[PDB]
Amino acid sequence: SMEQVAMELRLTELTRLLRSVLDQLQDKDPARIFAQPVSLKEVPDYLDHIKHPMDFATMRKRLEAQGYKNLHEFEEDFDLIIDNCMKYNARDTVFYRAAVRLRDQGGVVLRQARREVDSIG
């Protein structure tokens, strides 16, 4: 149908905008602490602690399959990255601190993303 096509064009355009958001958030992680999944070879107990692991490469895979239907779904995954780190790692660690800085800096990016998503529809 033509409606299905229009819906698909909307999803494509959301994916475009979320790709730019993802790039901007990942720039706020210049140490690449959140770039890849926590290695279960190197942290073998991780899944005992963290039930839903997340990282930027995993988000990018979902994004490129057009697997985010709306900004809320995308934000859920970004918040997992931050929140998982702040639980597994203590306050005095470079990992926790990186997560705080990512959260604080990403907030600005996400605030305008939400306005754009609503504005363009």
Side-chain angles (χ1 to χ4, degrees), residues 1-2 4-6 8 11-15 17-40 42-60 62-68 70-110 112-119 121:
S1 77
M2 199 42 239
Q4 288 297 313
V5 171
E8 294 163 355
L11 176 65
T12 301
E13 284 305 295
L14 175 66
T15 305
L17 178 159
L18 296 182
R19 189 175 306 111
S20 171
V21 175
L22 183 66
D23 291 345
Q24 284 176 71
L25 292 173
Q26 185 152 27
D27 288 337
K28 309 313 175 156
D29 173 31
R32 300 194 69 86
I33 290 167
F34 305 105
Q36 293 292 333
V38 170
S39 171
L40 305 175
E42 306 172 355
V43 187
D45 73 358
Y46 190 63
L47 298 183
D48 292 343
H49 290 267
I50 296 303
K51 297 296 168 184
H52 293 99
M54 192 49 51
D55 66 274
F56 289 128
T58 299
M59 293 188 62
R60 195 171 294 278
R62 180 164 167 192
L63 180 63
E64 293 309 334
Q66 301 190 344
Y68 295 114
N70 53 52
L71 182 55
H72 180 76
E73 288 188 347
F74 177 99
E75 293 173 319
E76 283 196 333
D77 272 355
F78 180 63
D79 287 334
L80 280 178
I81 293 177
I82 299 317
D83 291 339
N84 289 345
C85 184
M86 294 173 73
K87 294 168 187 75
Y88 190 79
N89 305 106
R91 233 162 9 257
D92 72 335
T93 62
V94 62
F95 306 108
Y96 185 113
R97 289 163 174 283
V100 167
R101 290 166 60 83
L102 176 61
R103 189 197 61 189
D104 283 350
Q105 296 194 281
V108 180
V109 174
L110 290 169
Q112 201 51 39
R114 161 53 63 207
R115 293 190 67 83
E116 288 176 355
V117 170
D118 293 357
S119 191

